[PDB]
Amino acid sequence: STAELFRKIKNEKISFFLPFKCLPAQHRKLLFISFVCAVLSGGTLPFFISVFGVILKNMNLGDDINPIILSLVSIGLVQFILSMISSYCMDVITSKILKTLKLEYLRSVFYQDGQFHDNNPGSKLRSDLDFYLEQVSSGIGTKFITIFTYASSFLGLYIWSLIKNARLTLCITCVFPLIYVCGVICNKKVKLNKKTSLLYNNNTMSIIEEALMGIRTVASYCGEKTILNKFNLSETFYSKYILKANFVEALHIGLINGLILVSYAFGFWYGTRIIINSAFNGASVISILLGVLISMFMLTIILPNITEYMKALEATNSLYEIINRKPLVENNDDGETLPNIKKIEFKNVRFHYDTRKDVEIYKDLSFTLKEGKTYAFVGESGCGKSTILKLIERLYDPTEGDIIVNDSHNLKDINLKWWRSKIGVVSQDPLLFSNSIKNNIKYSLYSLKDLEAMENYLEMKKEYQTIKDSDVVDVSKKVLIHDFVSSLPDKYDTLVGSNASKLSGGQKQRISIARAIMRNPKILILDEATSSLDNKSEYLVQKTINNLKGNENRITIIIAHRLSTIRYANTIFVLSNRNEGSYIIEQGTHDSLMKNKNGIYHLMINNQKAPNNLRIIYKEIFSYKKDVTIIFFSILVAGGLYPVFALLYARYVSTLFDFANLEYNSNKYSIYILLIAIAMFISETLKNYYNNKIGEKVEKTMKRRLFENILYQEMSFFDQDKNTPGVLSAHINRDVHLLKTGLVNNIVIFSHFIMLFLVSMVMSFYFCPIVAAVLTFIYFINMRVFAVRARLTKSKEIEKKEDPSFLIQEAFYNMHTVINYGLEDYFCNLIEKAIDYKNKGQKRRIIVNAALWGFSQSAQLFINSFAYWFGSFLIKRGTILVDDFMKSLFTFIFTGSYAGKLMSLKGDSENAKLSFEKYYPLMIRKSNIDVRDDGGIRINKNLIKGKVDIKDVNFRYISRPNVPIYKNLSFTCDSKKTTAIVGETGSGKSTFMNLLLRFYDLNGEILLDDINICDYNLRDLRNLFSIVSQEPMLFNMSIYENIKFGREDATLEDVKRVSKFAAIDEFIESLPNKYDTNVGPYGKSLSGGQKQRIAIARALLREPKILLLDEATSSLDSNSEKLIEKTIVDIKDKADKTIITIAHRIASIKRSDKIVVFNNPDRNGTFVQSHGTHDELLSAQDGIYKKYVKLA
């Protein structure tokens, strides 16, 4: 509501002048012109309406109308022109301020403190800005000035009507407060139910996602239906509450079209009463009612524009605070500068992350750096040398340390600009621009050449070309890139690729090295200079760096990661942190640091050295007969009895200028209006409600089919990539709500529209055929051939989608490269390439789009005037009477207006019809693995031993049909004896389980009691197993139901019993709602041990004839570990249970009766190698069991 935001803004006092401040003084009054070019056009209707009654008095009495027509059309023309001016003004102003705020935002982005660069990652900002623009590019345009026109019209109409007659309109305007009251009272009761409706939807969302993620656990226990039931029981409440909301939503709508007619009737009635009591004519009564009515219409169209304007205001306040965010590390020029940089001293460098405020990395980084020295440094792959170079560059500052230089001055006194100026940097990867080869090289010295002109006298702009192509030649010859660049065509012309994508990487690193060399730093630094080079080119680069022109004044720090290239070094401060801070463990030269001791550096140098589909829907819709016929009848009644108002209004005008027999006529004609209103109420009520009552059922019978078919689909369908839970949950919600909102909201509208367009047109021919043909021709050539709004919105939206669309995107991925140089060189390379291409097309676009809007506001006036002229023309020569014309006219006009009114309620029809074909196969797609298909032998769960056998297997996934996984497996497990499996970790041990449970089918042969697997009625085959994953999963149901998952019929006492083996049934008796406390989503409200014990209890409740473990106690404490192992051995002691395990401790393997082993000689599969160690013969020959006892 507007009052909400008004009370909000009342206290902070945002300036309503705020968007209009990035403007010169010239645009202060080009704006002001449009103030007066949009108040005059509000004083138009008070003239038309004030002559409206006089025209009718003048036509049905004999006299002529010609002066008033010419008095009117001139005002129409000046309205056209005054409407044409304002568009051209306002759009230009908006484009200007829109450009300028963007160009301020880019600058403010380039002045973040380094920490903020890490806080908000990159392209998010690029995705934010544009969004805010489309909240303000189309929210302060012409639809701001449309306020004042309507306000002026309101004031003029009401006050003129009041001075002409006051008691009448006072007696009329006493019904509209009751509309506002009903509106708020209905809005309350709508929100109160809508929020509960929303509340009962996220539950279903969770039930879908959490169930699709952990899919195979559902298939193993066969717990499909106990999710469907919860889904339906949560869906029904949503349906009923949203229908209760739609009822009140439709009642108010159907009501507002009922009181306006009472207003008309009482108005005319009291008018005739005062006319009779007079002894003020009748021409002064037709206008008062229309004035008071269209006056209070403008208060329904002003407010959305105010909302959008406040929205633009808050959007701009959400951006100027970004532009007014100050960094801590400023690139000012207030800092001083030494003659040259001497003796950069470090001492106790301390710093923590501003995000994580309890983690330190450095303690005592401290050493000296003075000109004329050579060095060599190396760090581990987790040091944070990035932090070191960032602090050299001053992206951050320490917390306790110091950057003392020359033992007299800290870095804070030194100019950051001068500091980065005299530092050549090279980084890890070649992520460079796409301008050209040389332009990455000659633009560097700008960072210094600005100083030639900034402190001297803009001469900076002209000295760009002054740096010629001289140094590229020699700096290319040095790094040996001269050979290649002089070989391929377009030597210094073929640009470095799009975001550095065309040429080789190491050669782009040579370009970076040339940048560092050419910019003439007093301190030339390199970091990861030679990270991934070959031998000879690296050595030549080394020879280039250590012996540049005049190496007596420089500090040639180098950080390589190959240890055969740290040969020369005045000192090698290699460090370690073994964790609250590093410290330099190693100190010395290359020769006196490897042979020093058997230390860390010693180890380092040692190691390296079609239409059917939709008539499905229509078939579904053509079965609920009790709700189709009612909608049909309401459509008939509305379409039939709205036009009757027109020719009941005409007869009431023609009978007004007859002083005789007036009382009876009034008493007879007002009552029909009353009755028609009482019918229209009920019609619009029962029309806008069963629409949604039919919309609901199609959704909640399609969602059922989808979510019921998806569960039974085989596992290979889920193994694919596109079959992701996110997209599959996105479909079921979005496209189904579109099938509701899109389709049935565009089958009723067409029917009602066609009903009106037939009945009104036909019984408009019958009274005056000569006028109707003209009118239809006019509106035909106007709408379907000169669609002003269509062409306007098209020409808008095409060019509103939008080389400023190319440089901006690639200028953020290289945000670390722009800091090497280039801060304003691309502040002033986008202004040009914007302004050059805006205006040249903008002129034509805006002049056309302003003329087309100025035409649209003053078209009905000319048509109406022409109609009145053509009507009073024929009547003079005695061809048609007056009443027939009035009847043929009012019906057409009012019905056209109403038909255009309700037409603007459609929804998205095409995209829903499109998506229905996307997801139609899924509710019908064949899976060829169905738990329901029960053709096969039943597994009676009493005659079972558990003898598994493997004849031969050669299996491979379809995800890659190139990697063999099994090379002729063969082993057995006889009866009620453990068979442990010890092998290489990651060799694919936990895959045979999936084969056994028919998650995949067969290039291999598995037997159960010497019987094939495909003849078992697999529901029962999954009824006598129980697995244990690495981590179980706990759904959002109760602990009672989590344990009872799979088997619905079970007592709480049995749960208390089987919960004893897991030894967890004491913690549960430590809090209220013991077997009722609902765990959180994904089991995030409990521990890991509790989770596994609950999973074990769930597996044991079923009385599983065969057990299948996997990674028993990978992370549990010894207590729960030995309790579990106690359960294992105790349950092995009894018969009637064959167990198979995959352990990682001899503590359990000692009880193994046969220990089968898998090996991986070469990466092409596995096969059995060992059998029968049974803890006695650990290695009579070679094996891995010896390894897994001597390591254990």
Q: Is 851 in the site for ligand YMZ (CB under 6 A)?
A: no
Distance between CA 409 and CA 559 in Å, rounded?
27
Element holding 359 (H helix, E strand): none
Site track 861-900 with ligand YMZ (rule: CB under 6 A), x = hit: ------------------------------------x---
Footprint of ligand YMZ on residues 1013-1042 (CB under 6 A)? none
Rounded least distance, CB 50 to ligand YMZ, Å: 13
Which is nearer to ligand YMZ, 608 or 860 (by Cβ)? 860
Six-digit token string for 510: 């040579």
| H helix or E strand, kind and range, residue 607 | helix 600-607
For the CB of residue 210, give the shortest distance to ligand YMZ in the complex, in Å. Answer: 48
Q: Which two tokens stand for residue 1136?
A: 């009637």
DSSP, collapsed to helix, strand or coil, labels residue 1038 as strand
Nearer to ligand YMZ, 150 or 446 (CB): 150
For the segment 38-67, give every residue that binds ligand YMZ (CB under 6 A). Answer: 45
Q: Dihedral angle at the C-alpha atoms of 416, 418, 420, 422, nearest 10 degrees?
A: -150
Compare residues 241 and 853 and give the one whose CB is closer to ligand YMZ: 853
C-alpha span between 1141 and 1152 (Å, rounded): 9
82: which 2 tokens?
């005054």
- Binding residue per annotation — 26? no
- The smaller minimum CB distance to ligand YMZ, of residues 83 and 872, is found at 83
What are the DSSP E strand ranges found in 637-693?
A: none
Name the phi and psi angles at 908, rounded to 5: -80, 105
Is 1086 annotated as contributing to ligand binding?
Answer: yes
For residue 648, which amino acid is it?
A: L
The answer to the question of residue 294 lying near ligand YMZ (CB under 6 A) is yes
Query: Nearest approach, Cβ of 1037 to ligand YMZ (angstroms)?
Result: 53
Parallel, antiparallel, or unpaired: how do β-strands 1004-1008 and 1167-1168 relate?
A: unpaired
CB of 893: closest distance to ligand YMZ in angstroms?
8
Nearer to ligand YMZ, 401 or 639 (CB): 639
Query: Which of residues 205 and 783 has its CB atom nearest to ligand YMZ in the complex?
Result: 783
356 belongs to an annotated ligand binding site: yes
Q: Which residue in the set 71, 368, 860, 1114 belongs to the binding site for ligand YMZ (CB under 6 A)? A: 860
387 is in an annotated binding site: yes
Q: How far is the CB of 299 from ligand YMZ (least distance, A)?
A: 12
Give me the least distance between CB of 786 and ligand YMZ, in Å please: 14
Cβ closer to ligand YMZ: 38 or 698? 38
CB 1138 within 8 A of CB 973: yes
CB of 892 to ligand YMZ, least distance (A): 12
CA-based nearest residue to 377, from 206, 555, 171 = 555
Count of residues in the chain: 1192
d(CA 1033, CA 513): 54
Q: Is residue 901 near ligand YMZ by the rule CB under 6 A? A: yes
CB of 219 to ligand YMZ, least distance (A): 58
Task: Write out the binding residues for ligand YMZ, residues 629-658 only, by CB under 6 A.
Answer: none
Q: Is 1090 annotated as a binding residue?
A: yes
Tell me the CB-side half-sphere exposure of residue 70, using CA atoms within 13 A. 3
Q: For residue 201, give the nearest of 672, 703, 953 by alpha carbon.
A: 703
Judge whether 299 is annotated as a binding position.
Answer: no
Q: 1172 among the known binding-site residues? A: no
Closest CA to 386 of 361, 418, 422: 361
Residue placing its CB nearer to ligand YMZ in the complex, 83 or 666: 83
927 and 950 in contact (C-beta within 8 Å)?
no
From the CB of 257, what's the least distance to ligand YMZ, in Å?
A: 12
**Is 504 assigned to a binding site?**
yes
Burial 456-475 (b: 16+ CB within 10 A, else e): eeeeeeeeeeebeeebbeeb
* Contact between residue 1097 and residue 1043 where contact means Cβ atoms under 8 Å apart: yes
Q: Is 985 known to sit in a ligand binding site?
A: yes
Q: At closest approach, how far in Å is the CB of 896 from ligand YMZ?
A: 8
Of the candidates 294, 902, 295, 865, the residue with the CA atom closest to the CA atom of residue 642: 902
Half-sphere exposure of 1072 (CA within 13 A, CB side): 0
Give residues 1052-1091 in contact with ligand YMZ (rule: CB under 6 A): none
Q: Shortest gap between Cβ of 48 and ligand YMZ (angstroms)?
A: 8
Q: Does 932 bind ligand YMZ (CB under 6 A)?
A: no
Give the number of other Cβ atoms within 10 Å of residue 520's Cβ.
Answer: 13
The answer to whether 618 and 628 have CB atoms below 8 angstroms apart is no
- Is 872 marked within a binding site? no
Determine the size of the site formed for ligand YMZ (CB under 6 A): 6
Tell me if 355 is assigned to a ligand binding site. yes
User: Residue 39 contacts by C-beta under 8 Å, 6 or more apart in sequence?
Assistant: 148, 149, 152
Q: Please answer whether residues 868 and 65 qualify as being in contact, where contact means their C-beta atoms are separated by less than 8 angstroms.
A: yes
Shorter beta-carbon distance to ligand YMZ: residue 292 or 728: 292
In angstroms, rounded to a whole number, what is the distance separating the alpha carbons of residues 755 and 636?
Answer: 7
User: Is the Cβ of residue 152 or residue 1026 nearer to ligand YMZ in the bound state?
Assistant: 152
How many helices and strands, by DSSP H and E, does the chain display? 47, 12
DSSP string, 1000-1034: S---EEEEESS--SSSS-HHHHTTS--B--SS---
**535 or 860, CB closer to ligand YMZ?**
860
Binding status of residue 10 toward ligand YMZ by CB under 6 A: no
| 898 annotated ligand binder | no
State the nearest-atom distance from the C-beta of 900 to ligand YMZ, in Å.
7
Closest to ligand YMZ by CB, 44 vs 691, is 44
- 383 is annotated as contributing to ligand binding: yes
716 labelled binding-site residue: no
Q: Which residues are annotated as a binding site?
A: 353, 355-356, 381, 383-387, 428, 502, 504, 506-507, 957, 960, 985-986, 988-991, 1030, 1086-1087, 1089-1090
Under the rule (CB under 6 A), what is the footprint of ligand YMZ? 45, 294, 859-860, 897, 901
User: Residues within the annotated binding site for ATP?
Assistant: 353, 355-356, 381, 383-387, 428, 502, 504, 506-507, 957, 960, 985-986, 988-991, 1030, 1086-1087, 1089-1090
